[PDB]
Amino acid sequence: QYVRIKNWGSGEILHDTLHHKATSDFTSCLGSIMNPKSLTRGPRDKPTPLEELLPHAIEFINQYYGSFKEAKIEEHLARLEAVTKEIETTGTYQLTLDELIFATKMAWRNAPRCIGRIQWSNLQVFDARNCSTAQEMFQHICRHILYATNNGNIRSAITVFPQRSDGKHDFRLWNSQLIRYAGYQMPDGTIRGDAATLEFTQLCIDLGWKPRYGRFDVLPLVLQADGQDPEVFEIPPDLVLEVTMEHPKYEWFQELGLKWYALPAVANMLLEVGGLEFPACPFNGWYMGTEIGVRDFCDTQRYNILEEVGRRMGLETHTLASLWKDRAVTEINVAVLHSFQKQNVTIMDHHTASESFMKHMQNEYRARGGCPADWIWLVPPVSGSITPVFHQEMLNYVLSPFYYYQIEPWKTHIW
């Protein structure tokens, strides 16, 4: 009928009907889309039809064993054997810890939108597949956070909860990411904190969470175990490391009173592997300066500090042609970079990050002739062509294992 298109800046939606008048086979490309269904793995009422599960399981087990040098044919056949048996006896199966570890790295390895993949093999894996209660999820999450934070020297880690069984016993973190500041609709009409979390904030308020009406209040974990309703757990403040923003030259920068958390951790994605699905497996890497400096601090729909930094710098805030924005954003970026460095908190600039990826990609093509890459996400939000990845053509395809997006829980979940 038509295609929905959204502008994440103004929120506005548009209906496209023109593509119907398109020509032959051009490569309606849905690449500019944030959350396309092709990248989402949703709900389920019943187990995974054995006819499907078994083949995938086999492939996976073949990938795993085909991995290490100097094969283990016997172990391989036996595993292939043991796995089939377990499936026709249980209607599913359990991966060996090693398979898990292998799975999570390869999934990371196949994340087309991840620019830090040269680190793919460095990943701590916490096995919480035996978790059973919400409170137990909380403890696990707290442990993850403490380990990954490591007092500023960030470590990449992922904690894997129980796999989806029937489809109505899903463990799931309702949060987008582990640490995230709340956004409130103030009474005077203004918005305080992160405007991007307005709804989810309300959701937490609706679940009995007490708002602190601040600019940087760390939201609570909203966990749901097995299938039960979600329970709210506040994050122990001693566990949330932060960096206060300051510029190495403009002493008025700190007057802005900005800061950001040091831990970037995905909370709501799904890990598909060998037919198995893990609807709850939070993971983290470390930050790239521009995420905070450009996206978090300069997006219109976020903290939007660009004009304020402009005026303070004495720029011509009323003349786009003056390129005052290009100037301000660069200083905000140096502040972020500077502040993290001064406080000994791992971070990387987008230039070294870009080169890093290029080396990864070339290593990746040699080792296995390819590397799924989504240019639209790999090119930084500033200084695009000043970066190597901008001039690199790339193919974006979905392999397996893979980290998928999922439909927001509060939408498809009955209490």
Which 370-409 residues touch ligand H4B, going by CB under 6 A?
376-377, 390-391, 393
Tell me how far apart the alpha carbons of residues 358 and 372 are, in angstroms, rounded to a whole number: 13
Tell me how far apart the alpha carbons of residues 346 and 285 are, in angstroms, rounded to a whole number: 10
Which 365-384 residues touch ligand HEM, going by CB under 6 A?
377
Nearer to ligand 1A2, 250 or 390 (CB): 390
Tell me how far apart the alpha carbons of residues 358 and 378 are, in angstroms, rounded to a whole number: 10
120 belongs to an annotated ligand binding site? no
Task: Calculate the alpha carbon distances from 217 to 180, 214, 299, 301 in Å.
Answer: 8, 6, 19, 18
Q: Does 108 bind ligand HEM (CB under 6 A)?
A: yes
Q: Which helix (H) or strand (E) holds 123?
A: none
Nearer to a second copy, 71 or 386 (CB): 386
In this structure, are residues 208 and 191 in contact, taking their beta carbons and an 8 Å threshold? no
CB of 114 to ligand HEM, least distance (A): 3
**Site pattern 310..329 for a second copy (x: CB under 8 A):** ----------xxxx-xxx-x
The listed partner (ligand HEM, ligand 1A2, a second copy, none) that binds 33, CB under 5 to 8 Å by sort, is a second copy
CB of 197 to ligand 1A2, least distance (A): 8
Residues acting as catalytic residues = 114, 117, 286, 291
Instruction: Report which of 159, 141, 164, 157 is spatially closest to residue 232, judged by C-alpha positions.
Output: 141
In this structure, are residues 43 and 409 in contact, taking their beta carbons and an 8 Å threshold? no
The listed partner (ligand 1A2, ligand H4B, a second copy, none) that binds 228, CB under 5 to 8 Å by sort, is none
Candidate ranges 12-20, 116-124, 178-186, 191-199; the one touching ligand HEM (CB under 6 A): 116-124
Nearer to ligand H4B, 32 or 121 (CB): 32
Q: Does 279 bind ligand HEM (CB under 6 A)?
A: no
In this structure, are residues 21 and 387 in contact, taking their beta carbons and an 8 Å threshold? no
Which 156-215 residues touch ligand HEM, going by CB under 6 A?
156, 158
Q: Which helix (H) or strand (E) holds 294?
A: none
Q: Which helix (H) or strand (E) holds 104?
A: helix 97-109
Binding-site residues for Zn(2+)? 29
Binding-site residues for heme b? 114, 405
